[PDB]
Structures are given as C-alpha cells and as structure tokens.
Amino acid sequence: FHSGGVAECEGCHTMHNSLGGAVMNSATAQFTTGPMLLQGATQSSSCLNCHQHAGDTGPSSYHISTAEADMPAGTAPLQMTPGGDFGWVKKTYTWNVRGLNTSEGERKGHNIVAGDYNYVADTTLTTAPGGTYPANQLHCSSCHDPHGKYRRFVDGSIATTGLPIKNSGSYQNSNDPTAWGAVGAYRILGGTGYQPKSLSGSYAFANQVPAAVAPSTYNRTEATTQTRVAYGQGMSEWCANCHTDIHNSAYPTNLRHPAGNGAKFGATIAGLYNSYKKSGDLTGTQASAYLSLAPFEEGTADYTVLKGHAKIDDTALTGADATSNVNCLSCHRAHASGFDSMTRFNLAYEFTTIADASGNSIYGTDPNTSSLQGRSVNEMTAAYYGRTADKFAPYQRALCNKCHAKD
Amino acid sequence: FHSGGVAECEGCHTMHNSLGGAVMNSATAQFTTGPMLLQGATQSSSCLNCHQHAGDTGPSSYHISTAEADMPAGTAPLQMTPGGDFGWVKKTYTWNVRGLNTSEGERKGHNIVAGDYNYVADTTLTTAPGGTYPANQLHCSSCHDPHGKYRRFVDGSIATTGLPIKNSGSYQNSNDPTAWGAVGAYRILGGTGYQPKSLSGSYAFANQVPAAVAPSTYNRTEATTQTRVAYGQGMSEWCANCHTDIHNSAYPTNLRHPAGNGAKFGATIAGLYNSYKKSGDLTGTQASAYLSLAPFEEGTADYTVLKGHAKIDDTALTGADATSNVNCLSCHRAHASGFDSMTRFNLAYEFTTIADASGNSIYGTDPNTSSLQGRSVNEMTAAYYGRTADKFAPYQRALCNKCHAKD
Ligand code: HEC
Ligand code: HEC
Ligand code: HEC
Ligand code: HEC
Ligand code: HEC
Ligand code: HEC
Ligand code: HEC
Ligand code: HEC
Ligand code: HEC
Ligand code: HEC
Ligand code: HEC
Ligand code: HEC
Ligand SMILES: [Mg+2]
Ligand SMILES: [Mg+2]
C-alpha cells in the first residue's frame, strides 16, 4: 500500500461518499466527508480504519493497535512491535500496599485524538515537555508523512523531491536505490520542514529522517529468539523536533542524561554493557550481548554495513564500543508501552522478578502487591515483549543496569 | 526501597526534569539536573528529600534528621536512633560561670554539606583527624554505598558481586541468605575499595563492612526498656578507613585508648562492667548489665548466635567477659550526638545529675549553670536517649565508670 510513498489516494479519501450503493465511511451521511476529504471522524481515524483489525488472536504483520472489545479486562494489548501497541493508553491500574497507588493509563505512550474510537487527548500534558507542540492535535500524520515525500537516493542524500520512488527502503530485503528513482525513508515519518497544513502556527520540523533499518518481519514475540532493530544515526535529533530542551549531546555541561549523536558510549561503560548479562552475573562476551530491551545506536548512515545487522534470529547480538551513541529509544518506546512514562523496563518498585519460593524467578503472583502493581501475571508478561520471568535472576533488580553495572 | 540494594533508580535520579507537568525537584529549572543526574542541589540532598519529614511530632521509623522549623529554639532533635540525629549540628550553646563558656554546634557529629538546607561544612576540621579524607566532600554517600554492592553469602563471605540480592540482611527478622542469591551488608555502607567516583584522588577504602545486627524497630525512646544494638567484629577497623592513626589494637605499645578487634576487654575490667550498675553501687549480676550507653563488641561473625541478641525488650542484657572487644562506638555515636565530640555520655563538668534538694537526682534546673551548660532540662533529657535523671544516683559522676569503676 504505502510503498515508501503516496499509496492509492482513494484508500484514505472519498471525493464524495458514494461507492455505488451507499456511503464508504460509516461516520457521516451520503455526500459529506471528514475534516479533509479523507474518510474518518478525524485525520487519524483513517489509519485505525486498517491498523486496528476487528477480532485478532495474536500479533500479526502491521496492525499496531489491538481493539478493546478483544482484550476483555485483565489482558494485554497483543501487538509486539518496536514502536508499541496503543491499546495500552486505555489501561488504568490500582493497588494498595500502604495507601492507594494508581498508575494512570494516559501516561503510557502518546495520546492520539481519535474521537471516533475511545481515544481521548491527554489532560495533564497540555503541551509537549520539550518545545511547545500542542497535544490535542496529535495525529498519526504528525510524525508520519502520509504522502511520502522524503527520499533516499544512492549517494545517501535525503531530499523531498527529484526522482521517483520504487520501494519502502526500510527493511533488510528492501532493494537499495539505483541511479533512476529513490526509495523511502525509514518509516514514512516526515523529515525537515514537515508541518501538516491543517495545523497552523510556527511548529515546523528542523531535523532529518533518522537512518534506521528494521528486520522485515518486525512484529513478533521474544520469549525465544529476540527481535533486533538496527539504529543508524540522528534518531534522537529527530524526536528533538517536537522536544527540544531534552536533547543533550555534551553531558557534564548540560545536566541531563546524555542523548544524541554527540553522546558517545564510554570505553568503560561499553566494557560493562557486555559483561553484565543477567543481574548478579558479569560474564561478558560481546557475541551474546543482546539488543532489544536496551538498544543503542551504531552512529553510521552506511545502509549496507548497518543492514548487515537487523536480523530476527539471534545471530548478530554483538554489543558495542566507545563509538556507539545512545538515542532516546534506548530507554523509551516511540508509540506506547506498559510502563508509566513509556519506557521499556519497569522502574517502579525495587525488584522486577521475585523468587518464587525456591529459586527460579517469577514476576509474582498476587495482583494487589507491589511486585505487580495491579498487573496480573499475563499482563506483565506482555509488558515485556513476551519474555518469561526466566531470563532474569530470581531477584532481578532495576534494569538500567545493562549499562551501569550497579549489581 | 533500598532492599539491601539498588532501589528504584528514578527515586533519586531524573533523566530529564519533567514528570508530566513540570519539574520533579524544586532546585532547578525544567530540563536541568543536580551534579550527577540525581535530583538535589548536592549528592546528599537526595537522601534528606525522604529522611527529613516536614512536620513530625515524635521519633518514627527511619527519618534520621528532624527539621529546624520544628524544634523551635529550646528543644531537642526528635530522632532516637543508634546513629544519631543530625539536627544536633545546628545547636550552639552559651553559659557563664566564671567567664564565657561556649560549646559550638559543628563539633557534635559529622557535617554533611547539604547547601540546599542550612547544613554547612566544617571549619575547624578541614580534614579528618586520622588519615586525610577531605571534609568539604562529606556526603551521606561517602560512608553509605547507594547502589548496594556488598553482599553476604551463606558461607559468611563478603563480596561485591556474584549472586542476586533478596533482602536487607541487617535485622533480627531478616531472612538469612540461601544458596541462590545473597543479602545486603549491615547498612548499605560500602566495604573494600568503595571510592565514589565524584571524589577524585587516592582516598579508597581498605577494610570490610563490619558485622552487626540491629533490632528491627531500632528508632525508639529508652526511658522504659532500652534499645540494644548487637555488634559483631570489625566495627572499628571500618571507621579506620577514613581515620587511621587513631586505630589501636595493642595498647601499652601504642599509647592511645585501646580500640579494635585486637583489644580484648580484660578479665578484671570485665568483672567490673557487671558489678558497677549505678555510680555508688557495685551489685553486679551480668543478666542485668545493660547494653546501650556504653556498648561493646562480641567479636563473632556468626550471624545466628549474634542475632541471638539484639532484642528491643530488656531480656538479654548479658554483660561480657575477657573476650569482648571495644570498638570506637562504645564511646561515640556514628551520625551525631548532643556532646561536644559526639560521644554518648557527658564528660564536660564533674557531675551529670545533681541531687535536687532531698535526694532523687535531677539534671539540674537553671540553664545558666554548669550542671546543664546552657541546655534546658528537656534538651538534656533528649541528649541521652530520653532516660530520665532517675537511672542515675543523686550525684552521678562521669560515665566511663561503667567499665572503670572509679567510684
Ligand atoms: C495513515 C496516515 C497511515 C499511517 C500513518 C500509516 N499507515 Fe500503513 N500500512 C498498510 C500496509 C498494508 C502496510 C504494509 C504494506 C506497505 O507498506 O506497502 C502499511 C505500512 C505502514 C508503515 C510502514 C511502511 C514502510 O515501508 O515504512 C507505516 C509507517 C504506516 N503504514 C503508517 C495499510 C494501511 C492502510 C490500509 C488501507 C491504511 C488506510 C494505512 N495503512 C494508513 C496509514
Ligand atoms: C493521491 C495522489 C493523494 C492525493 C492527490 C492527496 N492525498 Fe491525502 N491526506 C491524508 C491525510 C491524513 C491528510 C491530512 C494531512 C494533515 O492533516 O495535514 C491528507 C491531506 C491531503 C491534502 C491536504 C493537505 C496537503 O498537504 O495537501 C491534499 C491536497 C491531499 N491529501 C491529496 C492521507 C492520505 C492517504 C492515507 C494513507 C493517502 C493514500 C493519500 N492521502 C493520498 C493522496
Ligand atoms: C521520538 C521517538 C519521541 C520520543 C522517544 C518521545 N516523543 Fe513525544 N510527545 C508529544 C506530545 C504532545 C506529548 C504530550 C502528549 C501526551 O502526553 O500524550 C509527548 C509526550 C512524550 C512523552 C511523555 C508521554 C506521556 O504520556 O507522558 C514521552 C516519554 C515522549 N513524548 C517520548 C509530541 C511529540 C512529537 C510531535 C510531533 C514528536 C515528534 C514526539 N513527541 C516524539 C517523541
Ligand atoms: C536508567 C534510568 C538509567 C539511569 C538512571 C542512568 N543511566 Fe546512564 N548513560 C549512558 C552513558 C554511555 C553515559 C555516559 C555519561 C558519561 O560517562 O559522561 C550515561 C550517563 C549516565 C549518568 C552520568 C553519571 C556519571 O558518572 O557521569 C548517570 C548518573 C546515569 N547515566 C544514570 C548510557 C546508558 C545506557 C546505555 C544503553 C542506559 C540503558 C542507561 N544509561 C540508563 C540509565
Ligand atoms: C541516599 C543515598 C540514601 C541513603 C544514604 C540512605 N537512604 Fe534510605 N530508606 C528509605 C526507606 C523506606 C528505608 C526503609 C525501607 C528499605 O530499606 O527498604 C530506608 C532505609 C535506609 C537504610 C537502612 C536500610 C537497610 O536495610 O540497611 C539506610 C542505611 C539508608 N536508608 C540510607 C527511604 C529512602 C528514600 C525514599 C525515597 C530515599 C530517597 C533514600 N532512602 C535515600 C537514602
Ligand atoms: C538504578 C539501576 C540506578 C542506576 C542505573 C544508577 N543509579 Fe545512581 N547514584 C546515587 C548517588 C548519590 C550517586 C552519587 C555517587 C557519588 O557521589 O559518587 C549515584 C551515582 C550514579 C552513577 C555515577 C557514579 C557511578 O559510580 O556510577 C551512575 C552511572 C548511576 N548512579 C546509575 C543515588 C542513587 C539512588 C539513591 C538512593 C538510587 C536508587 C540509584 N542511585 C539508582 C541508580
Ligand atoms: C565510624 C563509625 C566513625 C566514627 C566512630 C567517627 N568517624 Fe568521622 N570524620 C570524617 C571527617 C571529614 C571528619 C571531620 C569532619 C567534621 O568535623 O564534621 C570527621 C570527624 C570525626 C569526629 C570529630 C567530629 C567533629 O565534629 O569534631 C569524630 C568523633 C568521628 N569522626 C568519629 C570523615 C569520616 C569518614 C570518611 C569516609 C568515615 C568513614 C568516618 N569519618 C567514620 C567515623
Ligand atoms: C572514658 C573517657 C574512658 C577513659 C578516660 C578510660 N576508659 Fe578505658 N579501656 C577499656 C579496656 C578494656 C581497657 C584495657 C586497657 C588494658 O587493660 O590494657 C581500657 C584502657 C584504658 C586505660 C589504660 C589504663 C591502664 O591501666 O592500662 C585508661 C587510662 C582508660 N581506659 C581510660 C574499656 C573501656 C570501656 C569499655 C566499655 C569504656 C566505656 C572505657 N574504657 C572508657 C574509658
Ligand atoms: C461534479 C458535480 C461531479 C459529479 C456530479 C460527479 N463527480 Fe466525482 N468522483 C471522483 C472519484 C475518484 C470517484 C470514485 C471513487 C471514490 O470516491 O473513492 C467519484 C465518484 C463519483 C460518482 C460515483 C457515485 C458512486 O459511485 O457512489 C458520481 C456519480 C460522481 N462522482 C459524479 C472524483 C471527482 C473529482 C476529482 C477527482 C471531481 C472534481 C468530481 N469527482 C466531480 C464530480
Ligand atoms: C496512529 C494511530 C499511528 C499509526 C497508524 C502509526 N503510527 Fe507510528 N511510529 C513512530 C516512530 C518513530 C516509529 C518507528 C519507531 C521504531 O521503529 O521503533 C513508528 C512506527 C510505526 C509503524 C511500524 C513500526 C512499528 O510499529 O514498530 C507503523 C505501522 C506506524 N508507526 C503507524 C512515531 C509515531 C508518533 C510520534 C512520534 C505517532 C503519534 C505515531 N507514530 C502514531 C502512529
Ligand atoms: C531524547 C531527546 C529524549 C527525549 C525527547 C525523551 N527522552 Fe526521556 N525519560 C526517561 C525516564 C525514566 C523518564 C520518566 C521518569 C523520570 O524522569 O523520572 C523520562 C521522561 C521523558 C519525558 C517525560 C516528560 C514528562 O513526563 O515530564 C519525555 C517527553 C521524554 N523523556 C522524552 C529516560 C530517558 C533515557 C534513559 C533512561 C534517555 C536516554 C532519554 N530519556 C532520552 C529522551
Ligand atoms: C546523610 C544525610 C545520611 C543519611 C540519610 C544516612 N547516613 Fe548513616 N550511618 C553510618 C553508620 C556507621 C551507621 C550505622 C551505625 C549504627 O548503626 O550505629 C549509620 C546509620 C544510618 C541509618 C540507620 C541506622 C541508624 O540511623 O541508627 C540510616 C537510615 C542512615 N545512616 C542514613 C555512617 C554514616 C556517615 C559517616 C560514617 C555518614 C556521613 C552518614 N552515615 C550519613 C548519613
Ligand atoms: Mg500521554
Ligand atoms: Mg564536625
């Protein structure tokens, strides 16, 4: 459909609303339409018209959102992709230990306003923490550019026009560009100057489409072999478009956790990322040092050698060295997650995995404790991308430690 | 929170400073941070963010520091723990007898530099009396290791890595370690080689985490039944890390009051510790010989038999014999105290308790005398851990005597 580019216009727009018979979108009458000529209540209900299937059982290809009629109450959104499953946003949690703890739902992930569904805009965060981009006009089309303009040529340069598009250009199978026509950026997400014309003001991107390269069957479980998404450069400067203060290359001067291309890894830190495999253990051997749950940039726009990585079978795990950068995604997840500020690990209560009664870990077994924070065991097995509580020590502690071996 | 280990990283660090809304620590702007990525003006204002409650009435669980807005002027810090209540440091005293006596405030206890509060570093003592560790970089994190590395296994060995942590390991309730994962050292205070990387120089610990075992409701009054903290071995060699000359095992050769594991108690001295209960009286009977105000080591790392002691009801008082050692704490108190060089008893003026007008003792009744040295009666009832002037004879003299029966 979007083959790196402007798909099929009618797939998202009706020029009238009569496809023979009667209307094409059941959110209006015969001859009216959505805000633009597209077909939905809002500019972001047109993508949920195909990326939210009706009755799913397990994670499939795309379909990064699972319905709420499906996950009855005490279950977990079923779409294990590297961005996340928006199903999370509508998931509140309560539990008592010595008071009334309550992890809200609208703090896990970006809220898109899809009033056609039960998607509401955020309340607490009226704007974006960094710069000021407004948070009631947060549609899929804000980060993603539906009419894929931004192209990668063969010299590696990026522009918004000049030759035809031929393919996605965002996989391992994706046939590299040639002298006659380019391919499309990592996801169709928009590069420099991509203000959507519906929005009106001064908010206009400034940094380029990042560099990265997905596996090509990116939506999977991770109990067995784990998914590895590659990460070229620029991936932080890009979120920097709508968060600005939070970017930080030089750490000591700017007191905030380093993130960017100007934030190298450290020869020492790097030694540690390998050594620390589990919690209490520091064996090492790069060949095994994973890349899922706390990944890292390679800092190299060479789509040939970096496509080198990005397999979906645990062959190239291949930790890092003091050249590797650390983008915002090494802690967070772009779409959403199960953890209060859309992180990848847990950071709410001292441990993550309790020791059952003997040894071998388990996430815990009582939904009104602090080990689980009101999240039944299946839930929190899906909060991580379906990896059992057996890839962690009986009393696994917090999980920055994959870098900072504070064990 | 610190369950023997690395608690909850975010509890002490912000990676940015925006927890939704606005900032998390009100000591900086939106997207800046403390010296390390933690949240406070200094590396030791992060622990006072939870161990100094706002308005307290009486001593509670932890909270070893009571605010100054609370104790108006003529009152006493309200935290009766076995380390002490830092509230003392900011307490000067004046009185006249035949001149102008003035017991300063910054001599009672270690000064931590918490510029975020009214905590200033020491002036008179620019370094530490023993070796040279500098006394403007004296943070809670200097003696205490926030990322609890040091573990006790089941063989009793101590290391800084190798198995997971499961619990504090520093109480009577604390479930002993097992073959799969260890517990944490007596307090999280750091063992061998624990230089904090902020500090830069040669100052690097050399001796191990001591051995001791607290009661498990350690913060209490003592008017009624008295708190007994147990004391394994090594407790002096440990303060020896930052004071070195002052350690002394063999007395006659090294002329300074004996202190350590190589400093036994004496069959004669030991006979005396029991006999002398009050000042003028020498009844004896070990079963009653206390252990609070002048305690002593047992010299035994056997966490089972030494946990045997350490109750908080006056059952095991159980004086000693010529094997018992004498650590630095048998005279001093680790955090602070009300007595000029942070001791446990008074050693300023001949007596401690005057005889009122009839007999039964009282600390005295006139704040400009020498009996009180400018410390109103309530004050000096809290200088001792709330024990009235009725556990002492009408004219109680100095208080080394619990060992040296110089009465
Ligand atoms: C509305 C604006 C959106 C947005 C923001 C995205 N989609 Fe689609 N999508 C569909 C299919 C079949 C695919 C796979 C086939 C193909 O891409 O040609 C995709 C893929 C994507 C991607 C990744 C593609 C890439 O190469 O980078 C992204 C980032 C994406 N989508 C976002 C199917 C549909 C639809 C079915 C008709 C509709 C409608 C949309 N998508 C709309 C959107
Ligand atoms: C096929 C060639 C077309 C053509 C001719 C157009 N589109 Fe679409 N379009 C989509 C969305 C979500 C928007 C909203 C953008 C926003 O909110 O800012 C639009 C917008 C337009 C416009 C107005 C804005 C502009 O910059 O031009 C126009 C003139 C336009 N489109 C024409 C979504 C989609 C699709 C979803 C996958 C697809 C396919 C297309 N558009 C294709 C076309
Ligand atoms: C690039 C991949 C990123 C990353 C890693 C994050 N963002 Fe966004 N963001 C935007 C708005 C309006 C908000 C407030 C809206 C809301 O709260 O739903 C946010 C918020 C966040 C958070 C906190 C989310 C929360 O629920 O509290 C986080 C952790 C986060 N962001 C990470 C708007 C935008 C953008 C506008 C175009 C862009 C681009 C990004 N964000 C990009 C990213
Ligand atoms: C999870 C919540 C955390 C937390 C609390 C911290 N980290 Fe890291 N970080 C990484 C690198 C390479 C650095 C280098 C800083 C430098 O060496 O100049 C940092 C920086 C820090 C600091 C600075 C402390 C210092 O000694 O300067 C602190 C306090 C800190 N972080 C806390 C890299 C990583 C990771 C790589 C994948 C991960 C994961 C984390 N950090 C996670 C966290
Ligand atoms: C900053 C570095 C510090 C330091 C040096 C200490 N704390 Fe805490 N503390 C908190 C709570 C609830 C407890 C009891 C619960 C538990 O320990 O799990 C403690 C306990 C301690 C101890 C004794 C613990 C032991 O088992 O030995 C010590 C030595 C100690 N603290 C020192 C609460 C907090 C906080 C609340 C968020 C914060 C922040 C800190 N403490 C920070 C520190
Ligand atoms: C959770 C797993 C983490 C991680 C990943 C880190 N910390 Fe902290 N930390 C605290 C304090 C007071 C300091 C200052 C130490 C000093 O002054 O020397 C630090 C320091 C760090 C660093 C830099 C120093 C180092 O040796 O690494 C790093 C990389 C780091 N931390 C990561 C205080 C605390 C806490 C207070 C109770 C808690 C909880 C954590 N840290 C947890 C973590
Ligand atoms: C282990 C439990 C001990 C004991 C029993 C004492 N210390 Fe310390 N000490 C350090 C520094 C820099 C000073 C000077 C700073 C200051 O004066 O505030 C001190 C001072 C003392 C004193 C005199 C205190 C006073 O106010 O005059 C006493 C009685 C004392 N110490 C006892 C530094 C350190 C350490 C650095 C890591 C460590 C460990 C200790 N001291 C340990 C202990
Ligand atoms: C409070 C200020 C004091 C003072 C001034 C003294 N003591 Fe004691 N000390 C203890 C033990 C077991 C010894 C053995 C020395 C030995 O027998 O070899 C000592 C040593 C001394 C001496 C040496 C005098 C001598 O005859 O060799 C002196 C002069 C001295 N101390 C003074 C044990 C204790 C305690 C056990 C809990 C306490 C309390 C004190 N001493 C307190 C003090
Ligand atoms: C001016 C008044 C008209 C009239 C009378 C019609 N057209 Fe359009 N139209 C366009 C496209 C792409 C379609 C079909 C696909 C789709 O909407 O997704 C249509 C459809 C119609 C119909 C079909 C009725 C039905 O099948 O339900 C009819 C009768 C019709 N039109 C008449 C596109 C355009 C267009 C630009 C692309 C313009 C300009 C017009 N239409 C104008 C008219
Ligand atoms: C609104 C409902 C949507 C829809 C349909 C999609 N997005 Fe996004 N998204 C963003 C980024 C940076 C990525 C790539 C990040 C990564 O690969 O880790 C994605 C990813 C996707 C995909 C495929 C990849 C995947 O799901 O892992 C798809 C199909 C997709 N998106 C569609 C960024 C944002 C964003 C803010 C930055 C917002 C809002 C959305 N996406 C919303 C939507
Ligand atoms: C690179 C520029 C970024 C950007 C744009 C964001 N992150 Fe982080 N961040 C981390 C953690 C644990 C939290 C929440 C909990 C806490 O701070 O105690 C956050 C928070 C955010 C927000 C929240 C704003 C708010 O809620 O007030 C936003 C918008 C945000 N981040 C964006 C952790 C990390 C991290 C390592 C753990 C790295 C690396 C980054 N962040 C990088 C970025
Ligand atoms: C700075 C503000 C702090 C904070 C928050 C704490 N400490 Fe210490 N402390 C030291 C030692 C040896 C002990 C144990 C001594 C004993 O048990 O007698 C303690 C004790 C504590 C506790 C609990 C036990 C208690 O309070 O009695 C807590 C919660 C605690 N500390 C926190 C040693 C030092 C030290 C120099 C050696 C310094 C400086 C601090 N502590 C400072 C702080
Ligand atoms: Mg939100
Ligand atoms: Mg002092």
Numbering used by the authors:
A (entry chain A), B (entry chain A): 26 to 432
Paper text:
Determining their respective contributions has been complicated by the previously reported association of OmcS, a cytochrome known to participate in some forms of extracellular electron exchange, with conductive filaments. We conclude that these thick filaments are not simply associated with OmcS, but rather consist of OmcS monomers, thereby representing the first example, to our knowledge, of nanowires composed entirely of a bacterial cytochrome. The unexpected filamentous assembly of a c-type cytochrome in our structure suggests new possibilities for long-range biological electron transfer.
Individual filament segments were extracted from cryo-EM images of conductive e-pili preps and, after analysis, the resulting 3D reconstruction produced a map at 3.4 Å resolution with extensive contiguous polypeptide density that could not satisfactorily fit with any combination of PilA monomers and also showed multiple regions of density along the filament providing excellent fits to c-type heme molecules. In subsequent fitting attempts using the sequences of several related Geobacter cytochromes, only that of OmcS provided a near ideal fit to the density, incorporating the full OmcS sequence corresponding to the 47.5 Å filament repeat and accounting for all 6 hemes per OmcS monomer. Each monomer repeat extends ~4.8 nm along the fiber axis, is rotated 83° and is ~4 nm wide except at the intermonomer interfaces, where the fiber narrows substantially. At the core of the fiber is a continuous, unbranched stack of hemes. Successive hemes, approaching edge-to-edge, alternate between lying parallel and perpendicular to the previous heme. The interatomic contact distances are all ≤4.1 Å. The OmcS sequence includes six Cys-x-x-Cys-His motifs, with both Cys sulfur atoms covalently attached to heme substituents, and His as one of the axial ligands. All 12 heme-axial ligands are histidine side chains, with 11 coming from the same OmcS subunit, and 1 (attached to heme505) from a neighboring molecule. Notable exceptions, which are solvent-exposed edge-on, include heme502 (from one OmcS subunit) and heme506 (from the adjacent subunit), which are both located near the narrow, intersubunit interfaces (on opposite sides of the fiber). Each OmcS monomer also includes one octahedrally coordinated metal, tentatively identified as Mg++ based on its density level and experiment, whose biological significance is unclear.
